[PDB]
Amino acid sequence: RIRIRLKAFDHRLIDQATAEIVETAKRTGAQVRGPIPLPTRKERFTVLISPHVNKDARDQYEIRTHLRLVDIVEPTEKTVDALMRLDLAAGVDVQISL
């Protein structure tokens, strides 16, 4: 029903401080979904570390940007009060659906 997309950088953030909305939603809603993974949409760069020549040294970058989305699904539409106005979180893509 509802899609709940949690998309944040660190595992110390997509997993931590994110339980506070799963909590409050139990009473108001009627179900919870646990934290379901997703194939993680990630990057890696290369920037030439030198200011001039020397391509033997380039700084090679990586960047996991984790995706456990949780994705609580609710036919119960009384969830919304304690879900979204009440609780708050930043550093994490918070997205809701019908």
Add this chain to the structure above:
Amino acid sequence: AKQSMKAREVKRVALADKYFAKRAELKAIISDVNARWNAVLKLQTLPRDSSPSRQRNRCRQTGRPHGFLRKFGLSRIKVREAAMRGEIPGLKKASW
């Protein structure tokens, strides 16, 4: 730096979507590859003005084209500088 070289570059972007882009893009069928009609055609080749194909994306702290990254909107070094100091979330050294 070279303040002067930069200054130029800036103003091209104002006109780029204020006297061009939807002023110019007004071509429709009769002036593209769909169809042709020389009337309209030759009088919308008539203004040239500013153009984004005469604009490079540029670094916003150098304005050189060499070693450019769209992705951060800045050049080679003006990524690496920030990135080494650990200012930017989650960029890290390759280590897999």
Add this chain to the structure above:
Amino acid sequence: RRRVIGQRKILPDPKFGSELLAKFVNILMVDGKKSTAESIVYSALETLAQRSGKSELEAFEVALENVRPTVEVKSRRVGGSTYQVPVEVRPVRRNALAMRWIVEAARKRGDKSMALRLANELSDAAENKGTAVKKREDVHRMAEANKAFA
């Protein structure tokens, strides 16, 4: 060096049951790939089978273990004087080397296909058309007749 360095063991040919046959595909390895190699192996194998209802495997074996390499020249110290020492070859490495050579010898016989090569080529056992006879007349020529020591 200070360690004897080799690598993993290759698998024996699984549809004739024979490691030698699989190590000769490797010799013929074309595009980096065993596949297009195995074809021709098998093509010329049959050629040999027709002329030789009995084993056609003992015309590889005889030819190449008649040839017994032994020569190189090195030097080591002995009693405070170095001396130019001639050195023998160990009987195992004689084997290991010899199997390769005959099959190396193909793709230069100026045929159309590796059929006509490896077929006519391999069949001989002591009257070789392969490099095996052609190294005989150098190995024993050298040894102990222009080699001052074992």
Add this chain to the structure above:
Amino acid sequence: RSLKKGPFIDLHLLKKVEKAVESGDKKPLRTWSRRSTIFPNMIGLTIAVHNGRQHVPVFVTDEMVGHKLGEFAPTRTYR
């Protein structure tokens, strides 16, 4: 390169041409421009096309089935 699906006109300096075909040309137009289709009907003129330091008079030739000004001027000079 190509005029695409149906043709272009390739306007580049088409503000002088309409003045100079009302008494003809015979006189060397100081022209920076190096592009514009020379039309087979715009002939008998004297175009001084640029090469970036000298404008050279070039008398247009008949039957120009699709060509540029640029192709008829020096670009860099040999030994």
Add this chain to the structure above:
Amino acid sequence: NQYYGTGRRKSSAARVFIKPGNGKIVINQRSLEQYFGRETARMVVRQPLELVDMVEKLDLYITVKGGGISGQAGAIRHGITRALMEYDESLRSELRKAGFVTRDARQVERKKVGLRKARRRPQFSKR
């Protein structure tokens, strides 16, 4: 199904449900030589099966995904005898020392900056 096996070898992981029934290899509604063209590969993974002789007496379904051609067959070879260490725990030793629950770790290595491949570097000359 009554015995399961993983076996993930050469980037291909293959499900194994060993079912009660009779010797046959049914894999994606086909056989080996039917899910692939000419193969050397087909013989190699039957090698544990003749090792003490089976597949005349039970049936199996396999669902291999991804990786190689040989890599797929890598997975098949791996998972069958990770489901035949649990059919038989007496051949537990005779499968680990016969290198069939041994994972192949010769896996393709990554490219680097300033190098053409994993170790390859440019040639230099001057003549």
Add this chain to the structure above:
Amino acid sequence: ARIAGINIPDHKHAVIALTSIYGVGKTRSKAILAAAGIAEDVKISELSEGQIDTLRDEVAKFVVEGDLRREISMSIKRLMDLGCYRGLRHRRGLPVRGQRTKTNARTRKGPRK
């Protein structure tokens, strides 16, 4: 065979035999044979002279041979008359179509020392 005039290669399939021999190349080879309903993999060893009648007609709908070879040279010299970038360039035979004008020009400009 020959078509009717000028030899072409013999004892070889018909697509082969048509060759590149001025305005009839690879594409034109099998397209022509397909067109006149004669079989493509008919050797001149296997080539009939009832096949021969329908042949000649389809190659007459293209400017081929000596005829072709005029027009072309008239047009390479065309561009020079103009004195085109392509034009003048042909007087020492310098690359026109893609190729370096500095170097690497062995087979257009001629070779190194």
Add this chain to the structure above:
RNA sequence: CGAAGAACCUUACCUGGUCUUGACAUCCACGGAAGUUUUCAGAGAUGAGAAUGUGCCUUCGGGAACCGUGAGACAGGUGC
């Protein structure tokens, strides 16, 4: 190799058009809402125009933004 893209433009180089508190900075004074759509000539830069808009606050003077002009202290220089 610097340069993970040299048409013009970029790009420093060149030839030409053109300017000198300035293209880019700050501050002071003057004039003017900012702007809007348009004409002619020029390669364009621009130069010279035609109409049109009369905003934001006011303590009604005054300001706030911004445009043009004036003037220097200054400014500019991928120059060594």
Add this chain to the structure above:
RNA sequence: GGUCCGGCCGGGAACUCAAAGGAGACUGCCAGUGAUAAACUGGAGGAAGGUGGGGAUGACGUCAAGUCAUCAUGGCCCUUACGACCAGGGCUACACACGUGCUACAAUGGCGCAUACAAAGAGAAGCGACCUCGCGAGAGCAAGCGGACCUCAUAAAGUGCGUCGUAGUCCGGAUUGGAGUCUGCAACUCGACUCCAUGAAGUCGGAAUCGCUAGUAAUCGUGGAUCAGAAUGCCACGGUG
């Protein structure tokens, strides 16, 4: 179980996968060896032993190494200008020489047919299916997706068959002619792509010279960045080996 037979439907979370948190390896045990010393060599068990495999980490320092043009800056210098703004041209000459690459010379191959299995990224002025036309490049028409949904998307060597026969050819592809597509106001110098025609040199390379120790070399594709629009370049990914 159902099935439009298609994980197409419910359904079950087992399973692969996903990805957060763990289990494990410690010469730890077993024998021998060793100054009874440290320690070493075999053995076992295990997915993995004796710096397991692959990254990332360059000491005190040296090279007045490079880089005032990435940027920062001491001094020096230019000041109706070594300043500034614009249009055109150049940076894609060429008479040679060299570096770094790419492509072939062929049947262990080339071509025609059908066919097998991948991994990892990309993305709302965005990717653009579809369906229509276009031989074709591609143009039209237009859905879908904020992308473990939809689009880019279609792996290629490989495989079974058809053939050609070791010819500079059916190899190879340069050169050039003519006609087109597309990005851009616009492609003449100096943009990329396609159609046809023309069809090269090269018959596996001297003296000499280089890399690479294992999934390495080898080989076959694939994607990404850059980028209005220019990869035989760079960066990254797997298949085979």
Add this chain to the structure above:
RNA sequence: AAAAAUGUUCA
């Protein structure tokens, strides 16, 4: 235990 020179001035 396999022949072999030579290095403009200046921190």
